[model samples]
Target: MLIVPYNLPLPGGVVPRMLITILGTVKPNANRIALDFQRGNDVAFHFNPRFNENNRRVIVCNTKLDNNWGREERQSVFPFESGKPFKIQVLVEPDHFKVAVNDAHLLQYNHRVKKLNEISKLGISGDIDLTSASYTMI
Candidate 1:
């Protein structure tokens, strides 16, 4: 379950492209962290698969991991299932979304949505729990 509150909102943008993120923690046993953005069909980002139920829906970080240029590939946990509430702290910039989870570990992923600027709304969906979420534009 998410343990944060008061996600700060920021100014939005229209330009679309690729971006990266720095996760706070790489949950010691996390299945994967999603760069959840936008709504509806055709939205995606770097996904990692969870090996166990206890592994999924969690966040962890490590200083050893590369900063801004960590692992080349994202680590696809289980697909986002309904009922999960994982909040994605997305640094929405013109090129891409720099997602930082738990505020430590980070990931670099390309925008999955074709029309980037069209997606202005945000929310979290899955099996986990959502405490709070916010967006910021760089």
Candidate 2:
């Protein structure tokens, strides 16, 4: 867990069956955290899990083009718990991205921006202990 905001820019961008794994722990006082696959400032894949007092929380996925943010898909039963370790897996498919947490199926978000190669950077920010980020061709 080093660096608060981090970016891993892939030279060739994404391909089919590329599984990205992010392992981390949400801070006890965490309110939100954002994970993104980006093309410069344009966000291709945006996964932001958010929470508030009294355990109100949601996992949101979306996209952004230019300065406009797209529709939000929210899941109420997000797998992450406050101050607990989390395992996030993102499988890049030809047409969409498959997301899982703690080895359990989470949700799928279809590509809003079709050119996957342009989204070359992987990034994250917000309140969490980001342990490691890795990927494999599967």
Candidate 3:
């Protein structure tokens, strides 16, 4: 399984109000996994066991937004868990957190607070057998 620790943005020493976690496959037209975080909360996303016979993985953003359910930014509109084993990418900007599972699936959201930069803490743990993790702006 792949796991990594991500530091959230915490501007002015303030924590976010809520957190969301997403899991999914990395294949074209694949499915996705997502969850709203609640501290010490965890989720797991599984596939068809034969992950070698699928497409790519991608990353997306996760947060709360008014137009989240009606966006078409790929990272904003896509299902989860389409049966595949690939790379997963996560793009966490200032106001949004994007996620791409296997370069195929996508998800997006809005930051929970104005000083979200202070919430920089990540714990990526899983049981995928051969999973790993990394950060972008670390």
Candidate 4:
């Protein structure tokens, strides 16, 4: 497991409707992987996929504001596999963030922090080997 931090492109940062792609491979004995977008003390988004949850698969999505985590959105449609690579794309929209895993539409998470551009930091952690991660302002 590795924790990677990215300073989103300077100046304006990421804008609405823009897509940020996170590419990586899950470790053979991986238990989880997390993608987090933060600004200062607020976490705008937290995407987590669990591979070792009591022998079940799940994905958890949430946000943190003022150091408090919000209610998590849990889903069972996990597309990640041990030792397999994945591409998770998150699109910043006005009301919500649309996410796609492995080029397939996955889920949408409503914005907890409305100002998308303020989310200048991106972090990835847990039991995965990240190959590369980048963002595109559309």
Candidate 5:
């Protein structure tokens, strides 16, 4: 499934708090995956999974603003595998976003855009079959 620039519903039309869950399966020959949280033309968070970048599997997390990318936070703990199902959960907080993969805490990304309410969209793309995606307010 391909759903980009997805509009996210804020509980009671407010923001700065929410939980996002994504269920999907990685393609056998998956190369990369990208999950973006957007607000207008800015990207609050850019979460990417690269199966093998120069022979290393890594997760690259960053933020984009004014058409420029911030420093990337790379994680070496490859929890995703080709031809496998996965669950990703993201908890949005006032200061940072907490992420979990397959029921395990993965990493946390500090808010690049302090005003979380502006983040009203979600974009996902990559070599993965998105089975389902859901969200709720905390």
Candidate 6:
């Protein structure tokens, strides 16, 4: 079984036109789950999906450098379901990263710390069970 707080290293790190895919399922009564791309302690992109944040669902994305969080971008589309498997795809573009949930376009976050190839690892955690994760240049 896969564990929480998992880290997957990208072979060539992150770059423009690269596609990263994550497969997982949220457990019952879960509130949130996070997929974060990082370079050491700095988070380049934080992809968080919230199930019940004060009686509502939210998908929040943002950045963190020097452990300080920047302004958060939040929205919800309900493509994420508790106790069901889902696929999350992150497509790196020239200016932003596009997120697609289960093959449906979801959201995008602009580059905060733009040295893409240095953001070499992805950390996953919270309220979810991971099946697998991988990345490929496109």
TM-score of each: 0.44, 0.94, 0.40, 0.89, 0.89, 0.94
Q: Per-residue alpha-carbon lDDT of model 5 for 44-124, expressed as tens digits?
A: 889999988999999999999999998999988889999999999998876788999999999999987877767777777
Candidate 1, residues 1-138, lDDT tens digits: the string is 354221222224224332222223333333443333333332333343333545444332211112232233433333233434333445545555555544533554555455655554332332334444533234
Residues 37-121 of candidate 3: C-alpha lDDT, one tens digit per residue: 2122221111112212245333332333432422222222333344445465555555555555556535544644344434443
| Residue pairs in collision within model 6 | none
lDDT tens readout by residue for model 2, 52-125 = 73667888889988889989988887788889999899999988899999999998889887778787899978
The residue pairs found clashing in candidate 2 are none
**Count of clashing residue pairs in every prediction:** 34, 0, 51, 1, 0, 0
Q: Report the CA-based lDDT of candidate 3 relative to the real structure.
A: 0.36
Q: TM-score of the candidate numbered 3?
A: 0.40
Identify the candidate with maximal TM-score: 6
The residue-by-residue lDDT of candidate 6 on 1-138, one tens digit each, is 488879989765688889989899888888989988997899999999888889999998989989899999987676888889989999999899999999999988888888888898999988988888878878
Candidate 4 per-residue lDDT over residues 1-138, each given as its tens digit = 234443444245457767888788888998888888887778888899998778899999899989899999998899999999889898888788899998899999887787776888777888877777777778
Better of 4 and 6 by lDDT: 6
lDDT of 6 at 35: 89
Ranked by TM-score from best down, the candidates are 6, 2, 5, 4, 1, 3
- Backbone clashes counted, model 5: 0
Query: By TM-score, is 2 or 4 better?
Result: 2
